C-alpha cells in the first residue's frame, strides 16, 4: 500500500 514515507514501495501509483 502507498505510504507517504516510502514512495513506490508496494505502491505502483507513486512511480
Amino acid at each position, epitope marked *: 500500500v502507498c505510504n507517504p514515507l516510502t514512495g*513506490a514501495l508496494l505502491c505502483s501509483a507513486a512511480e
Partner: antibody
Amino acid sequence: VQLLQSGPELEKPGASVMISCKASGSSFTGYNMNWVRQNIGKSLEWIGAIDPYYGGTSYNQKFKGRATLTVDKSSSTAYMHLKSLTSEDSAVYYCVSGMEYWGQGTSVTVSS
Amino acid sequence: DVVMTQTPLSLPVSLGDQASISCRSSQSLVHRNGNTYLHWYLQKPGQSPKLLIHKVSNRFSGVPDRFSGSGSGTDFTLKISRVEAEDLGVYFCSQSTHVPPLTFGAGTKLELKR
C-alpha cells in the same frame, strides 16, 4: 501506534528464526510492515516489507529467498522468518509501520 | 544501492549549542514523481528509533521545532538550533527514493562536550 515484538532468540548456524510484531493503535491494513535490522556497530539494514490488506511483499535482494514476511490480520500481527542463519545475522531486528513507528526490537544471536 | 554518507561519526556539543549533521547520497534522491524521500530518525540510548523529519524538511507529529531539515538532490542537513539533554543519541538519515532497498546512513552520535 504501538508495535510489540517478541523476545530474544538464540539459534545455531544453519537454523531458522521466526519473530513476531503485534500492532496496535492505527489501521493494521493501512501500513506496509517494514523490517530493519541493526548490526553490531549500530548500522541499519532494511530487509523488506509486507502489505497487510492482501499480503504482497518487497525484499531487499540481499535477503530474497532467505527472509519470508507474513501477516495474520485476525490478530494484527506481522512475522519475520529468516533461514540459513549465520553469525552475520546476529542483530536486533525491528518492525516498522510505514517507516514511521518502530517496534522495540528483537535480539537474534546466532552461535554454536 | 544508494549509499548514504553521514558526517560526522561523532558530534560533541554543549547543551544549548547548535548542531548540524550532514548526509550525502551516492545519487540524487529526487524521485521521477518530484518527491525527495529523505528522512531523519533519532535513536536515544536504550530506545528504538523515532522519526524526526520526513521528506527533507517536514517535522513529524510531535517533534519540537528546534529540529529542522534542509537539502536537495544529494546533500542534506539536519539542524538542531539549541541542543537539549533529551536530544543526545544517534541520528540516522534514510532514503526511500530508490527502492528496494531502502538504505540508511551509518549514524551520527550526538554526545556531550567536556
